């Protein structure tokens, strides 16, 4: 059984991608839920779990069946504990892009997520670790990271830092195997 992964902070998206691209056997993603209509070639239980009733969803929600859920284009979307669960049962780390909120909800399900926080040392340090952004994008990212840390520090399984993404990525991989057992 494999603990799901929640990576937070600057470059978490590249981390998320690289783990998948490098270790596809050890990592995967769950199927999300949505109210919105199944399109032409789309598939129930592959693209999404589609829910017919906007209410049945809301019923499943408050019952806590979802670790995170929300509204887009006047339709609903969510990540069920279940869909996550089936990924984990498969022996695969479930890559999650979720609020730190979902971590509590995740712990509560006896699913034991590894929540890693990539910590920017400064503004400049964000620019070292992500070379595809402007100073101004970096300021915003450094600020999101400061609130994030200010708020959710205790939800973290680990905190990683580095002078390059390479170094960060390495720590991320170390942490995951170490806490995997």
């Amino acid at each position: 059984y494999a603990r799901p992964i929640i990576i937070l902070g600057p470059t978490k998206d590249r981390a998320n991608d690289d783990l998948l691209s490098e270790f596809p056997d050890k990592f995967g993603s769950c199927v999300p839920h949505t109210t919105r209509p199944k399109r032409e070639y789309e598939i129930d239980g592959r693209d999404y779990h589609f829910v017919s009733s906007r209410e049945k969803m809301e019923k499943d929600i408050q019952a806590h069946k979802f670790i995170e859920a929300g509204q887009y284009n006047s339709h609903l979307y969510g990540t069920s504990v279940q869909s996550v669960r089936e990924v984990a049962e498969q022996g695969k780390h479930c890559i999650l892009d979720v609020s730190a909120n979902a971590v509590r909800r995740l712990q509560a399900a006896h699913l034991h997520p590894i929540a890693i926080f990539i910590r920017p040392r400064s503004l400049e340090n964000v620019l070292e670790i992500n070379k595809r952004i402007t100073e101004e994008q970096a300021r915003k990212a450094f600020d999101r990271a400061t609130k994030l840390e200010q708020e959710f520090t205790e939800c973290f399984s680990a905190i990683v830092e580095g002078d390059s993404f390479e170094e960060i990525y390495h720590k991320v991989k170390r942490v995951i195997e170490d806490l995997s057992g």
Partner: peptide
């Protein structure tokens, strides 16, 4: 009220939502 990505609850539609 959702900003997320492939591995978010947005799933396949994350991209369309960035406009």
């Amino acid at each position: 009220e959702l900003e997320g990505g492939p591995y978010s609850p947005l799933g396949k539609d994350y991209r369309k939502a960035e406009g």
